């Protein structure tokens, strides 16, 4: 069996990698943050309740100016809100009514969407004529789209259900580099602050850090018991947090290349749907299937508060660029802004 | 400048509200259906009679709008994209008549899924012609795969369709109770299953899904008033 001998030597390197990771873990983060004073109880009330969507909200993305946001639901409707005054700006009908993602360009000119059509539809908001229409339909993915994020007006990174991620070119419509290596559906991704790198969490209970330019996976992070539903980079850009179905939120380190902390409770048994950090990274906000959002101290693993205002499970959570507010959209077609 | 900017914003919001309300009437009028098979189970015939990962099909029956969505080219793993189909009226399950055992496992995993607890499953026992000729020819057998069939007896309430072999009548109903065994074992009443012995050539499958959809709505309305 010439195939078997390859596995025997391959697992030795995996064993060697395991030994290296444990050697670098001289001391855990719990002892290094034992003397830090706790943040204490925090009160956060829903300042605004954005309503108007018909079907369940599946994703949302804050604007780069901390004012507008785009929310996509399962009725084929894209709504752009104004969080300050709660007035809709646009209502874009969708070709396919089974989208699971949306995005806001850093220039505020484009909005993308994708879902159970393997096609990432991109709309332009600053058209010369006046009405919002699809500018370019990016096709080439095999599985359903799960999360698409913008780099600039000419580049976009999309993660599909065919265990691959892509880096598209807007004008040409052809993907430049295709990222391979995942064994299961890719559910979420988050760009680094410098945009050089990005990680993606798939259904293999593993997160893989990719390189945007050369299209090669540098490091692989594992340790989760079940699949990963959402992921988010640390504000510093040298860490990220993953939300999984097995009801654990984990914090990883790029430089350490291993686990740092786990956020879990015996009471909590449902999976995590969305994870995001705060402005300073001290506060971690995680969504759950029990209709509640739990606020986790990212340095002490102790819950600081609970954001419970939704009648159904949350499927999207996002914190503004300046950290002034957090918007959590749930399956009850309601978006709430907490402050 | 606060007064000038707000004036245009209100008109846009009011105009969008009018357009959104109009589309809300249409969305609530149509009934969404999910056509799902066991893989090469003959479901292609149902969609035809009436690039892209989901095919959209709309047909008009008795002044009622239906919307059947068949998922094509998506990966075999349905554990992630099946949570979207938790607001559809029903799932039009098509089961080929091994292939039979794998059909039951997917149906059991759909019935017990937390999201698709409420959603009802319309079940079609298509490809019955091959099943009818399988027992008659004797080349292929099912009691070897399903040992309960030898001891199994024809149900009393079964209606004999004239011109059919009484032996194959037992085989057809045996699959129905095998699918109904899981449906009734873990059934809290929030959802139901409607087995149907359909064919690959009859055009009456449209009528069957029309009556079954009305049955679901009648039960849903009754339990909304706590009558049932």
């Amino acid at each position: 069996s010439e195939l078997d001998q390859l596995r025997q030597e391959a697992e030795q390197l995996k064993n060697q990698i395991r030994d290296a990771r444990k050697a670098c873990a001289d001391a855990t983060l719990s002892q290094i943050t034992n003397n830090i004073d706790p943040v204490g109880r925090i009160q956060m009330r829903t300042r605004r309740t954005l309503r108007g969507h018909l079907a369940k909200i599946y994703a949302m993305h804050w604007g780069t100016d901390s004012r507008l946001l785009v929310s996509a639901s399962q009725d084929g409707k894209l709504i752009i809100w104004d969080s300050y005054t709660t007035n809709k700006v646009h209502a874009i009908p969708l070709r396919s009514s089974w989208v699971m993602t949306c995005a806001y360009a850093p220039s505020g000119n484009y909005v993308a969407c994708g879902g159970l059509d393997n096609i990432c539809s991109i709309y332009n908001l600053k058209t010369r004529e006046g009405n919002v229409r699809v500018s370019r339909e990016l096709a080439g993915h095999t599985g359903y789209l799960s999360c698409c994020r913008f780099l600039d007006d000419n580049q976009i990174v999309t993660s599909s259900g065919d265990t691959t991620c892509a880096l598209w070119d807007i004008e040409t419509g052809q993907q430049t580099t295709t990222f391979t290596g995942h064994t299961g559906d890719v559910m979420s991704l988050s760009l680094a602050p410098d945009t050089r790198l990005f990680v993606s969490g798939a259904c293999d209970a593993s997160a893989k850090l990719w390189d945007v330019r050369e299209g090669m996976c540098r490091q692989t992070f594992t340790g989760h018991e079940s699949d990963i539903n959402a992921i988010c980079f640390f504000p510093n850009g040298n860490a990220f947090a993953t939300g999984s179905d097995d009801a654990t939120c984990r914090l990883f380190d790029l430089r350490a290349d291993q686990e740092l902390m786990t956020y879990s409770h015996d009471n909590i048994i449902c999976g995590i749907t969305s994870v995001s950090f705060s402005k300073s990274g001290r506060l971690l906000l995680a969504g759950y299937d029990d209709f509640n959002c739990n606020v986790w101290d990212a340095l002490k693993a102790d819950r600081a508060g609970v954001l419970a205002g939704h009648d159904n499970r949350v499927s999207c959570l996002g914190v503004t660029d300046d950290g002034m507010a957090v918007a959590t959209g749930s399956w009850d077609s309601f978006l709430k802004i907490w402050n | 400048d606060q007064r000038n900017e707000e004036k245009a914003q209100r008109e846009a919001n009011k105009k969008i509200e009018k357009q959104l309300q109009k589309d809300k009437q249409v969305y609530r009028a149509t009934h969404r259906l999910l056509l799902l098979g066991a893989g090469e189970s003959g479901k292609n015939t149902i969609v035809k009679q009436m690039t892209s990962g989901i095919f959209e099909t709309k047909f008009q029956v008795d002044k009622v709008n239906f919307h059947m969505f068949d998922v094509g080219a998506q990966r075999d793993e349905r554990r992630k994209w099946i949570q979207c189909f938790n607001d559809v009226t029903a799932i039009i399950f098509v089961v080929a008549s091994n292939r039979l055992q794998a059909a039951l496992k997917l149906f059991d995993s759909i019935w017990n899924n937390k999201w698709l607890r409420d959603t009802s499953v319309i079940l079609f026992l298509n490809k019955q012609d091959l099943l009818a000729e399988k027992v008659l020819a004797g080349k292929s057998k099912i009691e070897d795969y399903f040992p309960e069939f030898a001891r199994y007896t024809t149900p009393e309430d079964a209606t004999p369709e004239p011109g059919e072999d009484p032996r194959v009548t037992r085989a057809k109903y045996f699959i129905r109770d095998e699918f109904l065994r899981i449906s009734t074992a873990s059934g809290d009443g929030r959802h139901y299953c409607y087995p149907h012995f359909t064919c690959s050539v009859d055009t009456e499958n449209i009528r069957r899904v029309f009556n079954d959809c009305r049955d679901i709505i009648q039960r849903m309305h009754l339990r909304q008033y706590e009558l049932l």
């Epitope: 064994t183 079940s226 699949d227 179905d245 | 349905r78 794998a102 995993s109 759909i110 937390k114």
Partner: nanobody, 128 residues
Framework: QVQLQESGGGLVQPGGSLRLSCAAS????????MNWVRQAPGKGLEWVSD????????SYTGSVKGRFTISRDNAKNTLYLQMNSLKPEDTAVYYC?????????????????????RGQGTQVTVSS
């Protein structure tokens, strides 16, 4: 990183009793449903049996109810499959599968062609 390497298997005479022990690591075993899946030569994946988290609810495929018995031990996180009265028809490679989510009754994609939480099967041969 979950990985399931199971022992047992190999060439055996017809009717020769064998046991298939599945070793689990990387995840807690007390709250995950377990399954057994075989791959017949020239055919697709087939489902054999499953056991609930508590070990009470046990279900088998049609052809192995009178031949196979299964057990699960949570103290040593090992899953066992017992083979009795084998025939040349059922020869295949047996994979020890795991249920994608905990604290749930449904189980999806166990028999899927590409599954992340599935071990490397051991080929068993029953012939004379």
């Amino acid at each position: 990183q979950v990985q399931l390497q199971e022992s047992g298997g190999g060439l055996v005479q017809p009717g020769g009793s064998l046991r298939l022990s599945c070793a689990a690591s990387g995840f807690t075993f007390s709250n995950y449903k377990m399954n057994w899946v075989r791959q017949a030569p020239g055919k697709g994946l087939e489902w054999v049996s499953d056991i609930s988290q508590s070990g009470a609810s046990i279900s088998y495929t049609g052809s192995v109810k009178g031949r196979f018995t299964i057990s699960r031990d949570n103290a040593k996180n090992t899953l066992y499959l017992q083979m009795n009265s084998l025939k040349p028809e059922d020869t295949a490679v047996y994979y020890c599968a795991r249920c994608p989510a905990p604290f749930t009754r449904d189980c999806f994609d166990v028999t899927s062609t590409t599954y992340a939480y599935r071990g490397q099967g051991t080929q068993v041969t029953v012939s004379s």
